């Protein structure tokens, strides 16, 4: 089972450029990278020594979506590995950046619990809240149109050490296209 | 003058 | 009279033959000025009209880039209306654009519009107060909360309201000998039997410029709307316009059959008469 | 789904006089999709070189588009435009008519 992971990361900006690595232990001599959905695609690559190295060229939105990463040796047959984890790459950017706040407030002490709101105008279906240190986004869908935002909350549970959180919104037909970043907020413990 | 702005559909 | 800005794009999928056609073209009133073909060969925007021409480099890179990055747009929107129709990825598909706006005789902006269509229907348009937009069905209803959050509308109307109108009113300055020129039609009538108690009387209008032009019969002062042939109105290839209107009469009645022809460019409305 | 049935036009510049060059005109209008041929004819023979204008389009979506060359007329010579379209069984061909 290879690793795949994204450098600089699977949150790429419209137009700008990414390289997902496809990394393993044990030698292979061929790396498929496949991407699944509506845009389903198959890049063929040999490597080195061993990894492989595909560039996903300038970001637009039929580029976004679900890489998974196999190996195998040889040709023929194709002796295919177990698939990487999934890796979802992401375009953001496309629309009006939601607001994101804390409750109680983005202080708080060692183990009081926290909670980060998403919000906007704008009717997104979901909402993805991204955190610096971590690779993976929690997400959660929007409520129903209340006082005119839709909104969702993200429960963080006790809080231990700070976190820069940012918060992106999302329609339901087009889940790796997303809104522009939330202003980024800081979670202070005293 | 062509527009400059232009949004996915 | 009023005068108008007009752009139109259309992008079509070429499923295994190559990435999608596109193409662009700009007028001012009926004349041509500016245009884009993604198979033509200097992959530039290009002039024309010899009144463009006096745009500078810094016009055509800013013109070049847009209009690329407007195709860009189509082809993946290609992409995202297919799945929205659940369309296979075999067959070829076709969007539409056309936008612009109009000032009025004194230069004050009278309307502006944008409207979308996709294979040959109504997708979505800008409604008339430029703030809001009207969705034929339900996959464009998911285009409509995209472009709500993306703000285009407000991104359109600025565009209408603003450049839109200083553009226009620009190039009507700088082309003003021939976009103000009034050029009236050059008539003549032409006469045939067609047995021996009836003639055909077609009444011609050549070299006129714009396009807009009425021509009727009239068979002693009424007129004779159903048994009247005419044509639409042509491109002579020059720049004008012809058009030609036809009535078949018994013979020899002709001398009560008048031809009406009204066009700005004429003083005053001709009668023609056999 | 949507098919529309291109109208055509087959004209000169000016009025023929013969010895007198002018130009030759195909204008088809109101059709869709915007894939099509059309081809000038002397004498049934193909002429080689034809212009056209850029593709365009009207209110109601349907496509219009101006071919055309430069020629010059004689009594013998006769002109049609042929054009090619999915809406159409086969081939339609419209001859030039001089005397209108």
Same mark, same amino acid.
């Given at each position: ?87 979802d ?32 105008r ?25 006082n ?35 202003d ?7 | ?9 | ?52 021409e ?56 009278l ?111 009424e ?17 004008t ?34 | ?35 099509? +041929? ?6 049934? =023979?193909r002429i080689?070189?034809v212009? #056209?204008?850029? /593709? @365009?389009?009207? *209110?109601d ?8 060359? +430069? ?6 010579? =006769? ?5 090619? #379209?999915?809406? /159409? @069984?086969?081939? *339609? ?8």
């Amino acid at each position: 089972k290879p690793s795949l992971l994204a450098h600089p990361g699977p949150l790429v900006k419209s137009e700008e450029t990414v390289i997902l690595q496809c990394w393993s232990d044990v030698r292979f001599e061929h790396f498929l990278l496949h991407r699944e959905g509506k845009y389903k695609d198959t890049l063929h690559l040999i490597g080195e020594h061993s990894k492989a190295n595909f560039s996903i060229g300038p970001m637009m939105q039929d580029l976004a979506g679900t890489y998974r990463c196999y190996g195998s040796v040889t040709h023929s047959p194709y002796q295919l590995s177990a698939p990487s984890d999934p890796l979802d790459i992401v375009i953001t950017g496309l629309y009006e950046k939601p607001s994101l706040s804390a409750q109680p407030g983005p202080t708080v002490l060692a183990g009081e619990s926290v909670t980060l709101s998403c919000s906007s105008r704008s009717s997104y279906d979901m909402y993805h809240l991204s955190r610096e240190g971590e690779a993976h986004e929690r997400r959660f869908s929007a409520g129903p149109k209340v006082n005119g935002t839709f909104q969702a909350d993200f429960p963080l549970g006790p809080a231990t050490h700070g976190g820069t959180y940012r918060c992106f919104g999302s329609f339901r037909d087009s889940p790796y296209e997303w809104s522009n970043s939330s202003d980024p907020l800081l979670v202070s413990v005293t | 003058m062509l527009i400059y702005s232009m949004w996915g559909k | 009279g009023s005068h108008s800005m007009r752009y139109f794009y259309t992008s079509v999928s070429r499923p295994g033959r190559g990435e999608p056609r596109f193409i662009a073209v700009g007028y001012v009133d009926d004349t041509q000025f500016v245009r884009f073909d993604s198979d033509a060969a200097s992959q530039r925007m290009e002039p024309r009209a010899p009144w463009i021409e006096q745009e500078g480099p810094e016009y055509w890179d800013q013109e070049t880039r847009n209009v690329k990055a407007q195709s860009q747009t189509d082809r993946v929107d290609l992409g995202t209306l297919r799945g929205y129709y659940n369309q296979s990825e075999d067959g070829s598909h076709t969007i539409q654009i056309m936008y612009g706006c109009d000032v009025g005789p004194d230069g004050r902006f009278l309307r502006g519009y944008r409207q979308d269509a996709y294979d040959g229907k109504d997708y979505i348009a800008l409604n008339e107060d430029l703030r809001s937009w009207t969705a034929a069905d339900m996959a464009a209803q998911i285009t409509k909360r995209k472009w709500e959050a993306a703000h285009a509308a407000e991104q359109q109307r600025a565009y209408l309201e603003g450049r839109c109108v200083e553009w226009l009113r620009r190039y009507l300055e700088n082309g003003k000998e021939t976009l103000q020129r009034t050029d009236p039609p050059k008539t003549h009538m032409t006469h045939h039997p067609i047995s021996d108690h009836e003639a055909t009387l077609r009444c011609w209008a050549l070299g006129f410029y714009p396009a807009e032009i009425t021509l009727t019969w009239q068979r002693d002062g009424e007129d004779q709307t159903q048994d009247t042939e005419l044509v639409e109105t042509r491109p002579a290839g020059d720049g004008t316009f012809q058009k030609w209107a036809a009535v078949v009469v018994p013979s020899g009645e002709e001398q009560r059959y008048t031809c009406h022809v009204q066009h700005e460019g004429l003083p005053k409305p001709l009668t023609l008469r056999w | 789904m949507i098919q529309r049935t291109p109208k055509i036009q087959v004209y000169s510049r000016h009025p023929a006089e013969n010895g007198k060059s002018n130009f030759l005109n195909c204008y088809v209008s109101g059709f869709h999709p915007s894939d099509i +041929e059309v081809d000038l004819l002397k004498n049934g =023979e193909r002429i080689e070189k034809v212009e #056209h204008s850029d /593709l @365009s389009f009207s *209110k109601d979506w349907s496509f219009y588009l101006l071919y055309y060359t +430069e020629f010059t007329p004689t009594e013998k010579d =006769e002109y049609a435009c042929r054009v090619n #379209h999915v809406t /159409l @069984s086969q081939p *339609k061909i419209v001859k030039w008519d001089r005397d209108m």
